Amino acid sequence: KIFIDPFTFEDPNEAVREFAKEIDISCVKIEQVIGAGEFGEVCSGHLKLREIFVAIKTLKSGYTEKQRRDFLSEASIMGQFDHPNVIHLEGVVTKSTPVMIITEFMENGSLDSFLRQNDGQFTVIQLVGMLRGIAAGMKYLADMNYVHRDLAARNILVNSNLVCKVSDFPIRWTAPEAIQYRKFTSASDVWSYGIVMWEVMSYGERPYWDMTNQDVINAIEQDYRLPPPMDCPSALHQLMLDCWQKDRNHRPKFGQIVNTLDKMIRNPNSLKA
User: Where is this cross-link: Glycyl lysine isopeptide (Lys-Gly) (interchain with G-Cter in ubiquitin)?
Assistant: First the structure.
């Protein structure tokens, strides 16, 4: 399949009905409020269609036509994807109030926060496994011709089995060409993926630490690249450097990234360095 920008539809709502399942509100049960969203609250709950745990996003009452549209676009987009490492959309509630988007529940939440709360708690093979899952989800999106544009650990969700899934459908996470000529491509997402690799091996540390955006920009311009995180295998940091190649054409593709990570998993000694 191929990704279809919902906003190319003469009527954006059409994309919603096509790629998103309409769920009767009587099936949704909001239990608790997790966090805050751009258009409303982010909650957890159960969905009974075997009851299952689900993440639930609500649209703040008094919403404008555009706010509703932009909110639901997340579902018109997510609904076109079907991959183990891309957040699963259960459906949406639009024929009732409040409007909602229901997605699979991820117990461990956001990857950056998860890692910070579990600093140094995982084996190298487990962390590599997380990075593998993310690259796989991204390879799939890139294959669908979907450029994420905001790939970062805060935008990756983690389940109880440590499976990592791409979500969220930033300067220090963005490629130079993307910042200068606003040229966003999968190669641009690869640079971002490299930063994610750093976040993961650094257990949620902030990229470039206290550096300002301008400093980061200048640093990169001066051919500066983030050093290897503490106890981070050399092969992994090398992969990071490959993702941060000035020339976007020189950066590896997600398919090649997954292969490199898989070879490391198959040959654990390669991570000894």
Answer: 272
The verdict on 131 and 259 lying in the same domain is yes
Domain end call among 80, 105, 130: 105
DSSP assignments along 87-109, one per residue: PPEEEEE-SSSS-EEEEE--TTE
Nearest CA to 52 among 72, 74, 28? 28
Domain boundary among 41, 71, 105: 105
CB 166 within 8 A of CB 221: no
Q: Order the strands of the 89-93 sheet from edge to edge.
A: 28-36, 41-47, 52-58, 100-104, 89-93
State whether 74 and 112 are in the same domain: no
| Residue 129 dihedral angles phi and psi, to the nearest 5° | -65, -35
Known binding residues are: 34-42, 57
Active site residues: 150
Technique used: X-ray
Helix (H, G, I), strand (E, B) or coil at 194: helix
Can you give the residue range of the structural domain that contains 52? 13-105
Resolution in units of Å:
1.9
Residues 91 and 225 in one domain: no
Task: Please state the residue numbers annotated as binding site for ATP.
Answer: 34-42, 57
